[PDB]
Amino acid sequence: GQTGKIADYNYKLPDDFTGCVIAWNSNNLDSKVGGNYNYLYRLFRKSNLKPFERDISTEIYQAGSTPCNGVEGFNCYFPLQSYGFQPTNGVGYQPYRVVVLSFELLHAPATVCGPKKSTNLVKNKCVNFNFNGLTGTGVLTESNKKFLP
Amino acid sequence: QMQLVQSGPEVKKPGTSVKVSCKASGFTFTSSAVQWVRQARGQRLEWIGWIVVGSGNTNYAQKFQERVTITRDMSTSTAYMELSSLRSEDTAVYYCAAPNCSNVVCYDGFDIWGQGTMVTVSSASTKGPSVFPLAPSTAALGCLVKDYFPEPVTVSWNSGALTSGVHTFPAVLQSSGLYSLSSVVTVPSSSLGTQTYICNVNHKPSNTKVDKKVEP
Amino acid sequence: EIVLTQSPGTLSLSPGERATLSCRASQSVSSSYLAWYQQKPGQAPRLLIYSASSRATGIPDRFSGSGSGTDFTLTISRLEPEDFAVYFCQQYGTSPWTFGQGTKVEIKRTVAAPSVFIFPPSDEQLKSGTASVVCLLNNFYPREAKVQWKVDNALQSGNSQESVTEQDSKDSTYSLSSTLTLSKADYEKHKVYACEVTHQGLSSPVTKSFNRG
Ligand SMILES: *[C@@H]1O[C@H](CO)[C@@H](O[C@@H]2O[C@H](CO)[C@@H](O[C@@H]3O[C@H](CO)[C@@H](O)[C@H](O)[C@@H]3O)[C@H](O)[C@H]2NC(C)=O)[C@H](O)[C@H]1NC(C)=O
Numbered sequence: 216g217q218t219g220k221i222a223d224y225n226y227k228l229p230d231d232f233t234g235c236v237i238a239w240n241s242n243n244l245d246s247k248v249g250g251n252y253n254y255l256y257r258l259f260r261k262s263n264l265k266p267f268e269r270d271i272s273t274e275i276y277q278a279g280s281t282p283c284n285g286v287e288g289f290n291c292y293f294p295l296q297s298y299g300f301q302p303t304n305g306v307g308y309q310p311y312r313v314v315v316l317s318f319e320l321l322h323a324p325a326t327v328c329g330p331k332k333s334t335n336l337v338k339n340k341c342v343n344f345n346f347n348g349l350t351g352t353g354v355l356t357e358s359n360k361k362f363l364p
Numbered sequence: 365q366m367q368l369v370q371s372g373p374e375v376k377k378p379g380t381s382v383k384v385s386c387k388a389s390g391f392t393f394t395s396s397a398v399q400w401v402r403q404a405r406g407q408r409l410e411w412i413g414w415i416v417v418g419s420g421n422t423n424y425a426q427k428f429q430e431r432v433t434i435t436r437d438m439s440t441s442t443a444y445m446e447l448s449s450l451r452s453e454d455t456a457v458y459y460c461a462a463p464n465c466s467n468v469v470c471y472d473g474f475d476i477w478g479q480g481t482m483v484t485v486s487s488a489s490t491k492g493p494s495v496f497p498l499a500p501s502t503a504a505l506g507c508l509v510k511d512y513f514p515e516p517v518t519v520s521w522n523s524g525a526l527t528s529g530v531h532t533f534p535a536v537l538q539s540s541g542l543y544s545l546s547s548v549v550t551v552p553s554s555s556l557g558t559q560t561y562i563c564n565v566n567h568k569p570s571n572t573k574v575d576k577k578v579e580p
Numbered sequence: 581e582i583v584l585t586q587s588p589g590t591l592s593l594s595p596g597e598r599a600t601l602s603c604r605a606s607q608s609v610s611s612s613y614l615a616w617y618q619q620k621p622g623q624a625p626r627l628l629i630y631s632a633s634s635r636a637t638g639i640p641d642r643f644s645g646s647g648s649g650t651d652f653t654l655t656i657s658r659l660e661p662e663d664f665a666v667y668f669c670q671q672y673g674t675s676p677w678t679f680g681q682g683t684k685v686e687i688k689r690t691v692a693a694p695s696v697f698i699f700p701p702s703d704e705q706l707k708s709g710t711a712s713v714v715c716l717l718n719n720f721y722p723r724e725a726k727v728q729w730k731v732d733n734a735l736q737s738g739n740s741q742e743s744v745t746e747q748d749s750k751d752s753t754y755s756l757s758s759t760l761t762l763s764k765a766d767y768e769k770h771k772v773y774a775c776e777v778t779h780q781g782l783s784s785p786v787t788k789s790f791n792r793g
Binding site: 399401406408409410411414423425426459472473474475477478479480494496497498499500501504508511531532533534536538539545546548550 | 615617621623624625626627630631634636637668670675676677678679680681682697699700702704705708709712714716718739741743744745755757759790
Binding site: 258259261278279280281287289290292293296297 | 395397416418419420421463465468469470471472
C-alpha cells in the first residue's frame, strides 16, 4: 500500500505482497564527487499507478486545459527530473540501491528452492535412513548388484 | 477560504539582499508555479522571474538573470525570493503570483496574488518629522510634514474627521532622500477669526508626536 | 522584440461607455496565454480575463474581449460608475513575459475653472533649515496644469517639486501643489515671487502674489 512520491507514482507495490525487499546502502559505487546525475524519476502524472506497472513515457504532461505542442511553459510540464545526488547530501539523502523480489505460485512445476542434508552415512548399524524421497530403517551394507545408469 | 500570504515591510541598505516568502494555503501548492513581479511608485508593471513548485524549472528575465535566487522548499509549501546587491533604483514593491490549481486541473490564470511587500534603500539616517504651518492672509490653511525618514506616515486632525477639503498629498522624495508632504484644508467661510484651527500630526514608526497650532 | 504597447492612453467619459481598449502586439503570439489585470491604486490587481476568449470565476457586467494572433482588445459595455482603475496587459505564451503599458479611465465633469493661491513663508522659516514657498491649485477637472515660478526678472526651474492628489469623490476635482526651495543665506536677492498657471477654464492668465512688507 503506502503513499508518497514512490510506490505511488513510479513503482507501485501491490498489496498482498509475495516477495522479499532488500535495500543495502551505498555511498561509493554511486554518488560520484561533484554530483551524480544519471537517474531520473517521474514528477507529474494524470493518475495513479495500477499494481506492477512500468510507466516509461517522455510526453510532456499538461496541467491546465490548453493543449501544448511540445513547449515547456505554463500548464505543460516535463515530469522527468534528476536525482540530486551529492557527495555529502546527508544520511537521509544517500543513494540507496533497492532490490525487490517476487515469489509466485500457479498450476505449474516449481523449479527454484534449495535443500541441504549432506550428512555422512554409516554402515553396519541399525540406522534410520532418508534418501531423496524414500525413508526407512535398516542396516546399510555394500553390495555387488548392478544397476542400469 | 483560499488565499496567499506574503511577508511584511522591508527597509534595507545598498549592498544587501531581500527575502520575501509566499505562503500558499487552501489549495494543492505542489502542482503549481509561482511568478515574481515588481511594481514601482505609480509606474508600469514588470517581470522578475518564475519557478515551479514541482522543482527543476526556473526561468528568469534577461536583466533579472543574475543577482536573484528563488528558493522554493517543499516542507512548508511556500516560495521565497532572494534578490542580492540592492541598488537605489530598486526601492519598490514586490508582489506574488500563483494559479488556483486543484488536483486534476490547474487554473490557467494567476488568480491569487500576494499583498506585496516593499523595499527601500537609502542612507539609513532615521529622523523625526517636522511641521511647518501655512496660513492665508474663501480661505485655506494647513501644515506641511517634512524631513522624516522614508517610512509610512500618518496625517490626521485629532479626530479623523472634518473632511471639508483636506488635501493630503503623497510623500515626495527629495535630493537628500528625506520625505515631505503637505495637508491644506479650506475654511467653511470667512469666519477664520473664531473656532479652533489645529493641524495635529501623528506618527508611529518613530517616537515623534508633534502638535502645532495654525494662526493667521 | 516583444512589446504590449497599448493604443489608448487615457479615457474620460461618463458612466456608460463602449470602453474599447487595444493591446496590439508586435510579434505573433498564440491567443491562448494572455491575461488582463485591473489594478485599483492602493491594493493588488485582480484577474479579469484570460486565454483571450474566456471568463473568470465571477465578473460583473459581462466583460467581453477577443482578438487574433497580433490583435488584442477588450470592450466594457455600459461602463459602470465604480469601474475606474488601471488596466494592464500580460502575455505568458513565450518568455520573457512583458507586461502591459497601462490605461486609465475617469469621469467627465465639464471642465471647471481652477483656484490658485500661494502661502508666503512664516516666521519659523528664517530660523529653520531652508525657506520654501508653496502654491496650491484646486478644483480643476483637466490634468493640463502648467505651473511656472515667477522669480523677479528670472524664469528658472532649477529646483521645483510638483505634487498631485488622486481623483476626488464628492467633488470629482483635482488638487496640485508646487514647492520651491531657495538659498537660505538671505532670500532677499529677488523680492518678487509668484506662480502662474494656464488652464482651459481660465482664458486670460492669472498672476497673483504678495510681496513682503
Ligand atoms: C479555486 O478552485 C477551487 C476548486 O476548483 C474553488 O472551490 C470551489 O468553489 C466553488 C464556489 O463556492 C464551489 O461551488 C460550490 O459548491 C457547493 C457544494 O455544495 C454548492 O452547494 C455551491 O452552490 C457552489 O456551487 C466548489 O464546490 C469549490 N470546489 C470544490 C472542489 O469544492 C475555488 O472557489 C477557487 N477559488 C478561486 C479564487 O478561484
